[PDB]
Design a protein around this ligand. Structure first.
Ligand SMILES: Cc1cc2c(cc1C)N(C[C@H](O)[C@H](O)[C@H](O)COP(=O)(O)O)c1[nH]c(=O)[nH]c(=O)c1N2
Length: 137
């Protein structure tokens, strides 16, 4: 059981989440895909595996006004659980995802892969890989 929580500006992370979802469904696993704006730590608690979807913003950062408020709320129950990280970038890779990995790992949770894409999904099999991994917790 996987809660795929995504923040999508320009369709990108939605389509990424959809790709992941298909790989989860292929291995007969229950998926709950929602947006960062409409979720809660209590919901997350019921799912052994969680995936977070945030594109690269400003100067190689996470999306401050939604993802960081939800992350702080999430932190008390982000222990032991399998958390996969998925994001789209334009011109700069890695940094935002490294900082993101560091904070998600740091709460006592483990990272069930990191998917980085050049704007649009499919261009990185990583998305599908994360799907498979999430299906298998
Ligand atoms: C205000 C703003 C700021 C950034 C971006 C876009 C926008 C609109 N993008 C590109 C972005 O990661 C890419 O286009 C995503 O596929 C879509 O991101 P959003 O859904 O538009 O936030 C971007 N890309 C990148 O590689 N490093 C960066 O720091 C940023 N910063």
């Amino acid at each position: 059981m996987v809660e795929i929580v995504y923040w999508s500006g320009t369709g990108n992370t939605e389509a990424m989440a959809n790709e992941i979802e298909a790989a989860v469904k292929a291995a007969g696993a229950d998926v709950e895909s929602v947006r960062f704006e409409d979720t809660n730590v209590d919901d997350v608690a019921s799912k052994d595996v969680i995936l977070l979807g945030c594109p690269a913003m400003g100067s190689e950062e996470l999306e401050d006004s939604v993802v960081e408020p939800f992350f702080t709320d999430l932190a008390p129950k982000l222990k032991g659980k399998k958390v996969g990280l998925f994001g789209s970038y334009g011109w700069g890779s890695g940094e935002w995802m490294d900082a993101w990995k560091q904070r998600t790992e740091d709460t006592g949770a483990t990272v069930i892969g990191t998917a980085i894409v050049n704007e649009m999904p499919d261009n990185a099999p990583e998305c599908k890989e994360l799907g498979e991994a999430a299906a298998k917790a």
